[PDB]
Design a protein around this ligand. Structure first.
Ligand SMILES: CC(C)CCC[C@@H](C)[C@H]1CC[C@H]2[C@@H]3CC=C4C[C@@H](O)CC[C@]4(C)[C@H]3CC[C@]12C
Ligand SMILES: CC(C)CCC[C@@H](C)[C@H]1CC[C@H]2[C@@H]3CC=C4C[C@@H](O)CC[C@]4(C)[C@H]3CC[C@]12C
Ligand SMILES: CC(C)CCC[C@@H](C)[C@H]1CC[C@H]2[C@@H]3CC=C4C[C@@H](O)CC[C@]4(C)[C@H]3CC[C@]12C
Ligand SMILES: CC(C)CCC[C@@H](C)[C@H]1CC[C@H]2[C@@H]3CC=C4C[C@@H](O)CC[C@]4(C)[C@H]3CC[C@]12C
Ligand SMILES: CCCCCCCCCCCCCCCC(=O)O
Ligand SMILES: CCCCCCCCCCCCCCCC(=O)O
Ligand SMILES: CCCCCCCCCCCCCCCC(=O)O
Ligand SMILES: CCCCCCCCCCCCCCCC(=O)O
Ligand SMILES: CCCCCCCCCCCCCCCC(=O)O
Ligand SMILES: CCCCCCCCCCCCCCCC(=O)O
Lengths: 34, 230, 128, 338, 57, 376
C-alpha cells in the first residue's frame, strides 16, 4: 500500500475503482430517486 | 534371476551413492595445499611448524587443510605437476641469499605460473631465510648485486612497510626479490590466478594464519570470478 | 630422433669474444622455445638464457644479463649464442636445451641433471 | 675414454639409420592409397557414468566387456557396470593421487598406482565381504605412472624413475627390473600373447621390452616431444604412440622404423591416450583440446570427432570385443561411445 | 668410473638393438592390411551392430 | 475510501435513526409542510411559501458538505411534486460537483496506461525467464549450489509474473454489479498469492544477498550446509507472515475483497519486507566495501571501469533501486510510479540477462553445444 510499489499500484487502482463504482451507483440511485 | 541381480545391484548402487554423497561434503569442505620448495629452502622447518609424498592434516577455524610435501621424487617435474591443478593452492617456498638458487627458483615459479593447466591454481609464496639474507647483506658481500644487476639501480617502494630493527639495505633486498616475483607474476597479466608474496622468518607461527588468509582470498576471488564481478 | 649438437667453445682469454652454435636435428625447430644451461666444475646446473618460438620474448640470468646475445635461426635451424666481455667465473660445460612441449611458455625441468632433451655439451674455459 | 665411446655410439646410431634407410623399400601411405576409405564415423554416447568427485585420471576395461575400473584424484577407485550405469564397487584409496588402474584378466585383482610410489592391489573375491588391500608394493623411487596385469600373480608396472618392474604378487618382490630409459616412463601396453610389452616414456623413445630376457629388444625414436601413452595393435606386431607434439605415430616392430604419422595443422594440442579397435582399422586418440579423434589407420584421415568432454580427455579405453569406447576426462565424467 | 660404464652399457645396448632380423616394410604392411581386412566385418566400431543385438542401445 | 457495501450499511443505519427520530416530533405536528425521509435527508418542517435549504448530509463521502439542497413548500402544506410524474421535486445540484468525475476519469486512464506498461514488462520477464530456466536446467555441468539458488530466484520471478496475470484477471472478473433495494474466495486467493510471491521475490533477492555476502565476507562459507536453511527461510518465512496477515485480515475486517487496504493490518507484511530490503541494502554496502578492497589490492582506469561495471551489475542484483525509488523525494507521483513499476517489471529480465545471457559460463556452454551440433 504505502511502501511497496506494485502493491501501491494495485491497492490504489482498487481504491479508485471502488470509489468510481460507488459514485456511479450513488449517481444512478439519485437519478432513480429524482 | 535377472530381477534379483538387478535388485542386488541397485541396492549396492544406493549404498555406494550414499557413501559418495557423504564423502562429497568432506572433499568439497577440505582444502588442499602443495608445499613445493627447493632443497636449500627450509620446507622441513615448515612441515615441523605448520614413501613418495608426505601429508600434514590440520584445521583452522573449523576449516580442514591438507598440505602435501614432495618427498623422494625425481627432479623432472613436468608431468606430475599437472595432477596438482585440482588443489586449492600451491605454496611455493624459496630461500633468499655456492650454486645460484634464486634464478632457478624464479624460472621454476615462471614454469608454474605460465602452465596452461595451472592458470586456475593460485600460488602462495614464502620467502624464507630473511635473517640469513640480512646477515649476508650486512656482512658486506654483494652477492645479490653480483647475481642481480637491477638491485644496484633499485629504489625501495614507498607503499612497502619496513619492519623495525631492519637496515634499509635489508628491506631493499627483500622488496627487490618481492618485485622480481611480482614482475614474473604480472608479465602474463591474465588475472585468473593470483600470487601472494609473504616474507617468512626461520621460526614463526604466523605462517599458518597467512596461509589461512591467502586461501580465504583465493576462494573469495574464485567465487567472484564465478559471479563475473571480477 | 631428437638430437642437439653444441659447437664452439674451448680455452679462451677473459674480456674476449666467442660464438656458440646449436645444430638442432630431428624436430620441427620453429615451434619450440629453447634455452641454455651451464654446469660449473664442481657445481650444479644453473639456467643461462632463453629464446621463445618467434624470438620476441628473450630473458637472461642476471649475472650474465646484458653480456650474452641469444638468437635462433629457423631458416637454417641453428641456435646462436654470442658471448663478449668474458669473465674467469664463466668457465663451465654448456648445454643447449629444448623445452619439452610445443607452443608452451613453460620450461619446467630444463635445469635437472638427467634431463634428456639437451645436447651433450661443450667445454668453455676462461683461464688467464 | 669418453670420446672413443661416444663416437662409437654415434657410429652405431649411424649404422642403425643406414640399415633403416636400406630396409625402407616403400611407404605405408603409398600402398594404402588404393584402399577404400572408411568415411565419416558417427558414434553416439549411449551411457554416461557420473560417480567421481575429482578428475578421472586413468581407466582400464575388463576382459568381459562388462566392468570398467576408473581411478580419480579424490581417492576413489570405482568399478562400474557399463550396461546399467551402476557402481559395482567403490574403494577408498589410502593415497589421493593415483595415476593408473588395472583390472586382472581373471577379474580377481584390481591395481592402482600413484604419486605415493606404492602400487595397491585389491582382491575382489571379498571372503570377508569388504574390499581390503591385498598387497602394497613400494620399490620405486620415482612417481608411479602405469600398471597392467599379465595374470593373477605377476604385474608389469611403470614408474617415473626410468625403470619398469615385473612384480610377483605372491612374493611381493620384483621379479625383474628394466633399466633402459633416460626419461620418465609414462605408460606401458601389454601385447595379447604377453611375450613382449611396449613402454612409452618422456625421453621421446618407445621401448620394446622382453619380459623373460629383461632387456629392450628395440628402441623407436620418431617423436619430437614426450610420449604420453602407448597401445598395441591387435595382432601384436605393431604399436601406436600418442605424444605431446600433436602427432600419433604407428611403429612396426619388424620394420624397426616409423610407419605412419597422424597430424593436423589446426590441432596443436597434446595427446593423452591412444587405443586401437578390435580390427585395428580405426585408431582412437584422446587429444588435449577437449575432444577425441577417430583416425583411419590405413588412410591417415580423421574418420570422426567425439566432442563429448568439456575438459581434456585424460584416458581412452576400448573393449576387447570392440562394442564400446569409454573416455575419461578431467571434468569428472565418463562417456561411453558406441 | 660411472660415466664410462654407462657409455659401455649404451654401446652394448646399441649393439644388441642393431643385430636384429628385419622384415621388408611392404610385406609387413601388407600383413597389417590383411589383418585389417580379415577382421573388418566383425568389428563393431568399423561396422555398426544392429540396435537389437547392441547391448548398450 | 468508504466501501460501497459500507455506504449501503450507512444509508440503512441513517434510515433507522431517522425513523426513530420521526416518533419524537411526528405527534405534535404543524400546519406547515410535514417532515419526511426520502432516503437521503431527514427534512425539517417546511415553512409556507419559503424554500428550505438543507446542508448535504455528513455521512456521504462524495457530497459537498458546504452545499445546500433546495426544496419548496406550497401554501397547501405538501411538498411540491414534479410536473412529469408523482415525484417530490428537489434541487440537489450543490451536493454533486462535476470536477471529481473528470479527475476520476483522468486517473483511470493513467491506471490503464500503467497496467499496459507493467503487463508488457511482466510478459517480457516471463518469456525470457522460461528460456533461462530451460537453458540452466538442460545443461548438466551448470548444476551447482549458486545456480540452484538462481533457479529458485527465477522460479520465484516466473511465479510472481503468473501471479500478476492471474490476480489481475481473477480480480477483474470478480467485481460484478451488487445492488440492494464478490466475497468469494478467489478474489482473496489472488491477493494472497500477489503479496505472497511479491514477498517470495523480495526474500529470494535477500537470500542471494545473504549468499553472495556470505561467500565474500565470511571465511570459507559452506555452499550445501546453509542451502536448506536458505530454502527454508525463502519458502517458509513469507508463508509465515502472509498466513498471519490472512488470518488477521479475515478476523479483524473481512471486507468484500482484500484488495482494499487497511492501515493497521498492512504493516504485518510491510514491515518484514521493508526490513528485508533494508538488510539487503546493508549487505550491498558491505559487499561494495569488500569488493572495492579486493579491487584496490589487485591500469587504474581498468580498475575504475571494472568497479563501475560490477557496481551497476551489483545494483541490479541487490535491488538498490528499491531503496532509491522508495526513499526518493500529483503528476510527479505518477512519474515516480511509472519509474518504479518499469524497473520492477524489467528487473526479472535484467537478472535474466546478467545471469544467463551475459554470463560467461552459460555463453561458453551454449557456444560449445552449438559447435557440437554443427560438427554432428
Ligand atoms: C502449491 C503452492 C503452495 C506453491 C508451491 C511452490 C513451491 C513449493 C514449488 C512450486 C514450483 C517448485 C519448483 C519447480 C522447479 C524446481 C527446479 C528444480 O531444479 C529444483 C526444485 C524446484 C525449484 C521446485 C521447488 C518447489 C517449487 C518452487
Ligand atoms: C502455503 C499455503 C498453504 C498458503 C495458503 C494461503 C491461503 C491460500 C489460505 C491461508 C489462510 C486461508 C484463509 C483462512 C480463513 C478464511 C476465512 C473463511 O471464512 C474464508 C476463507 C479464508 C479467507 C481462507 C482463504 C484461504 C487462505 C487465505
Ligand atoms: C520486523 C518485523 C518482523 C516487524 C513486524 C511487526 C508486526 C508483527 C507488528 C508491529 C505492529 C503490530 C500491529 C499494531 C496494531 C495493530 C492494531 C490492532 O487492532 C490489530 C493488530 C495490529 C495490526 C498489530 C499487528 C502486528 C504488528 C503489525
Ligand atoms: C528494520 C527497518 C528497516 C524497518 C522497521 C519497520 C518496523 C519495525 C517499524 C517501522 C514503522 C513502524 C510502525 C509505525 C506506525 C505504526 C502504527 C501504530 O498504530 C502501530 C505500530 C506501527 C505499525 C509501527 C510498528 C513498527 C514499524 C512497522
Ligand atoms: C517462452 C514462453 C513465453 C510465454 C509468454 C506468455 C505471456 C502471457 C501474457 C498474458 C497476457 C494476458 C492479457 C489479458 C488482457 C485482458 O485483460 O483481456
Ligand atoms: C499455486 C497457484 C494458485 C492460483 C490460484 C488461482 C485461483 C483462481 C480463482 C478463480 C475464481 C473464478 C471465479 C469465477 C466466478 C464466476 O462464475 O464468474
Ligand atoms: C541460514 C543462516 C545463514 C547464516 C549466515 C551467517 C553465518 C555466520 C558464520 C559465523 C562463523 C563463525 C566462525 C567460528 C570459528 C570458531 O571459533 O570455531
Ligand atoms: C515457517 C517459518 C520458517 C522460518 C525459517 C527460519 C530459519 C532460520 C535459520 C537460521 C539458522 C542460523 C544458523 C547459524 C549458525 C551459527 O551459529 O553460525
Ligand atoms: C508483536 C506483534 C504480535 C502480532 C504479530 C502478528 C500476528 C497477527 C495475528 C492476529 C490474530 C488476531 C486474532 C484475534 C482474536 C480475537 O477475536 O480476539
Ligand atoms: C531501510 C528503510 C527502507 C525504507 C522504510 C520506510 C518506512 C516508512 C515508515 C513510515 C511510517 C508511517 C506510519 C503511519 C501510521 C498511520 O497511518 O498513522
Amino acid at each position: 500500500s504505502l511502501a511497496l510499489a506494485d502493491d501501491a499500484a494495485f491497492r490504489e487502482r482498487a481504491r479508485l475503482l471502488a470509489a468510481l463504482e460507488r459514485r456511479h451507483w450513488l449517481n444512478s440511485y439519485m437519478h432513480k430517486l429524482l | 534371476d535377472q530381477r534379483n541381480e538387478e535388485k542386488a545391484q541397485r541396492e549396492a548402487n544406493k549404498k555406494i551413492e550414499k557413501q559418495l554423497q557423504k564423502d562429497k561434503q568432506v572433499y568439497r569442505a577440505t582444502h588442499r595445499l602443495l608445499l613445493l620448495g627447493a632443497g636449500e629452502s627450509g620446507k622441513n622447518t615448515i612441515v615441523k611448524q605448520m614413501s613418495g609424498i608426505f601429508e600434514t592434516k590440520f584445521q583452522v577455524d573449523k576449516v580442514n587443510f591438507h598440505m602435501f610435501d614432495v618427498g623422494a621424487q625425481r627432479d623432472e617435474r613436468r608431468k606430475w605437476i599437472q595432477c596438482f591443478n585440482d588443489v586449492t593452492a600451491i605454496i611455493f617456498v624459496v630461500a633468499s641469499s655456492q650454486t645460484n638458487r634464486l634464478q632457478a627458483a624464479l624460472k621454476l615459479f615462471d614454469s608454474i605460473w605460465n602452465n596452461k593447466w595451472l592458470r586456475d591454481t593460485s600460488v602462495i609464496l614464502f620467502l624464507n631465510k630473511q635473517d640469513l639474507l640480512a646477515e649476508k647483506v650486512l656482512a658486506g658481500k654483494s652477492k645479490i648485486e653480483d647475481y642481480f644487476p637491477e638491485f644496484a639501480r633499485y629504489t625501495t617502494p614507498e607503499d612497502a612497510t619496513p619492519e623495525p630493527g631492519e637496515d634499509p639495505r635489508v628491506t631493499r633486498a627483500k622488496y627487490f626479490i618481492r618485485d622480481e616475483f611480482l614482475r614474473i607474476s604480472t608479465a602474463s597479466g591474465d588475472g585468473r590466478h593470483y600470487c601472494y608474496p609473504h616474507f617468512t622468518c626461520a621460526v614463526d607461527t604466523e605462517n599458518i594464519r597467512r596461509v589461512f588468509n591467502d586461501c580465504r582470498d583465493i576462494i573469495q576471488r574464485m567465487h567472484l570470478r564465478q559471479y563475473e564481478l571480477l | 630422433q631428437v638430437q642437439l649438437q653444441e659447437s664452439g667453445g674451448g680455452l679462451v682469454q677473459p674480456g674476449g669474444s666467442l660464438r656458440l652454435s646449436c645444430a638442432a636435428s630431428g624436430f620441427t625447430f620453429s615451434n619450440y622455445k629453447m634455452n641454455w644451461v651451464r654446469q660449473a666444475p664442481g657445481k650444479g646446473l644453473e639456467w643461462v638464457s632463453d629464446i621463445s618460438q618467434s624470438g620476441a620474448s628473450i630473458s637472461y640470468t642476471g649475472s650474465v644479463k646484458g653480456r650474452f646475445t641469444i638468437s635462433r635461426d629457423n631458416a637454417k635451424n641453428t641456435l646462436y649464442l654470442q658471448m663478449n666481455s668474458l669473465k674467469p667465473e664463466d668457465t663451465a660445460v654448456y648445454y643447449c636445451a629444448r623445452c619439452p612441449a610445443p607452443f608452451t611458455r613453460d620450461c619446467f625441468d630444463v635445469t635437472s641433471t638427467t634431463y634428456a632433451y639437451r645436447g651433450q655439451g661443450t667445454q668453455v674455459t676462461v683461464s688467464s | 675414454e669418453l670420446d672413443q665411446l661416444r663416437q662409437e655410439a654415434e657410429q652405431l646410431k649411424n649404422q642403425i639409420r643406414d640399415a633403416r634407410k636400406a630396409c625402407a623399400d616403400a611407404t605405408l601411405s603409398q600402398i594404402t592409397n588404393n584402399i577404400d576409405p572408411v568415411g565419416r564415423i558417427q558414434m553416439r554416447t549411449r551411457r554416461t557414468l557420473r560417480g567421481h568427485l575429482a578428475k578421472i585420471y586413468a581407466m582400464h576395461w575388463g576382459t568381459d566387456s562388462r566392468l570398467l575400473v576408473s581411478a580419480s584424484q579424490d581417492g576413489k577407485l570405482i568399478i562400474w557396470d557399463s550396461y546399467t550405469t551402476n557402481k559395482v564397487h567403490a574403494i577408498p584409496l589410502r593415497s589421493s593421487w593415483v595415476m593408473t588402474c588395472a583390472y586382472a584378466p581373471s577379474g580377481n585383482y584390481v591395481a592402482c598406482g600413484g604419486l605415493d610410489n606404492i602400487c595397491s592391489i585389491y582382491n575382489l573375491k571379498t571372503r570377508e565381504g569388504n574390499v581390503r588391500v591385498s598387497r602394497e608394493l613400494a620399490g620405486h623411487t620415482g612417481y608411479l605412472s602405469c600398471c597392467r596385469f599379465l595374470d593373477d600373480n605377476q604385474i608389469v608396472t611403470s614408474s617415473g624413475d626410468t625403470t619398469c618392474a615385473l612384480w610377483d604378487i605372491e612374493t611381493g618382490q620384483q621379479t625383474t627390473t628394466f633399466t633402459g630409459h633416460t626419461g620418465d616412463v609414462m605408460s606401458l601396453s601389454l601385447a595379447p600373447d604377453t611375450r613382449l610389452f611396449v613402454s612409452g616414456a618422456c625421453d621421446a623413445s618407445a621401448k620394446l621390452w622382453d619380459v623373460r630376457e629383461g632387456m629392450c629388444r628395440q628402441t623407436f625414436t620418431g617423436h619430437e616431444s614426450d610420449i604420453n601413452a602407448i597401445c598395441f595393435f591387435p595382432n601384436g606386431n605393431a604399436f601406436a604412440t600418442g605424444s605431446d607434439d600433436a602427432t600419433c605415430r604407428l611403429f612396426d616392430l619388424r620394420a624397426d622404423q616409423e610407419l605412419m604419422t597422424y597430424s593436423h595443422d589446426n590441432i596443436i594440442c597434446g595427446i593423452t591416450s591412444v587405443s586401437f579397435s578390435k580390427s585395428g582399422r580405426l585408431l582412437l586418440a584422446g587429444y588435449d583440446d577437449f575432444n577425441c579423434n577417430v583416425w583411419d589407420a590405413l588412410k591417415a584421415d580423421r574418420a570422426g570427432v567425439l566432442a563429448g568432454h568439456d575438459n581434456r580427455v585424460s584416458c581412452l579405453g576400448v573393449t576387447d570385443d570392440g562394442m564400446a569406447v569409454a573416455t575419461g576426462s578431467w571434468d569428472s565424467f565418463l562417456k561411453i561411445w558406441n | 668410473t660411472a660415466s664410462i660404464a654407462q657409455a659401455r652399457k649404451l654401446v652394448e645396448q646399441l649393439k644388441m638393438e642393431a643385430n636384429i632380423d628385419r622384415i621388408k616394410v611392404s610385406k609387413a604392411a601388407a600383413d597389417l592390411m590383411a589383418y585389417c581386412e580379415a577382421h573388418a566385418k566383425e568389428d563393431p566400431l568399423l561396422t555398426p551392430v544392429p540396435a537389437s543385438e547392441n547391448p548398450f542401445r | 475510501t468508504i466501501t460501497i457495501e459500507e455506504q449501503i450499511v450507512l444509508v440503512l443505519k441513517a434510515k433507522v435513526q431517522c425513523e426513530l427520530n420521526i416518533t419524537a416530533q411526528l405527534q405534535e405536528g404543524e400546519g406547515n409542510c410535514f417532515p419526511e425521509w426520502d432516503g437521503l435527508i431527514c427534512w425539517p418542517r417546511g415553512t409556507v411559501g419559503k424554500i428550505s435549504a438543507v446542508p448535504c448530509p455528513p455521512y456521504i463521502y462524495d457530497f459537498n458538505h458546504k452545499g445546500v439542497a433546495f426544496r419548496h413548500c406550497n401554501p397547501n402544506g405538501t411538498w411540491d411534486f414534479m410536473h412529469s410524474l408523482n415525484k417530490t421535486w428537489a434541487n440537489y445540484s450543490d451536493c454533486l460537483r462535476f470536477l471529481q468525475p473528470d479527475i476520476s476519469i483522468g486517473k483511470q486512464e493513467f491506471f490503464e496506461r500503467l497496467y499496459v506498461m507493467y503487463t508488457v514488462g511482466y510478459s517480457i520477464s516471463f518469456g525470457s525467464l522460461a528460456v533461462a530456466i530451460l537453458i540452466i536446467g538442460y545443461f548438466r555441468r551448470l548444476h551447482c549450489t549458486r545456480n540452484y539458488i538462481h533457479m529458485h530466484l527465477f522460479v520465484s520471478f516466473m511465479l510472481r509474473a503468473t501471479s500478476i496475470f492471474v490476480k489481475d484477471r481473477v480480480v477483474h472478473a470478480h467485481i460484478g454489479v451488487k445492488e440492494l433495494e464478490s466475497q468469494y474466495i478467489g478474489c482473496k486467493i489472488a491477493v494472497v498469492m500477489f503479496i505472497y510471491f511479491l514477498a517470495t521475490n523480495y526474500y529470494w533477492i535477500l537470500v542471494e544477498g545473504l549468499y553472495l555476502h556470505n561467500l565474500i565476507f565470511v571465511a570459507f562459507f559452506s555452499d550445501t550446509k546453509y542451502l536448506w536453511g536458505f530454502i527454508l527461510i525463502g519458502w517458509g518465512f513469507p508463508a509465515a507472515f502472509v498466513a498471519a496477515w490472512a488470518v488477521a485480515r479475515a478476523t479483524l475486517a473481512d471486507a468484500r475483497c482484500w484488495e482494499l487496504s487497511a492501515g493497521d493490518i498492512k504493516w504485518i507484511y510491510q514491515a518484514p519486507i521493508l526490513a528485508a530490503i533494508g538488510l539487503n541494502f546493508i549487505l550491498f554496502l558491505n559487499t561494495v566495501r569488500v569488493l572495492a578492497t579486493k579491487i584496490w589490492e589487485t591500469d587504474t582506469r581498468k580498475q575504475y571501469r571494472k568497479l563501475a561495471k560490477s557496481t551497476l551489475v551489483l545494483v541490479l542484483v541487490f535491488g538498490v533501486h528499491y531503496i532509491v525509488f522508495v526513499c526518493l523525494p500529483g503528476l510527479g507521483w505518477e512519474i515516480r510510479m511509472h519509474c518504479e513499476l518499469f524497473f520492477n517489471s524489467f528487473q526479472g529480465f535484467f537478472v535474466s540477462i546478467i545471469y544467463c545471457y551475459c554470463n560467461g559460463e552459460v555463453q561458453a556452454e551454449v557456444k560449445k553445444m552449438w559447435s557440437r551440433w554443427n560438427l554432428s
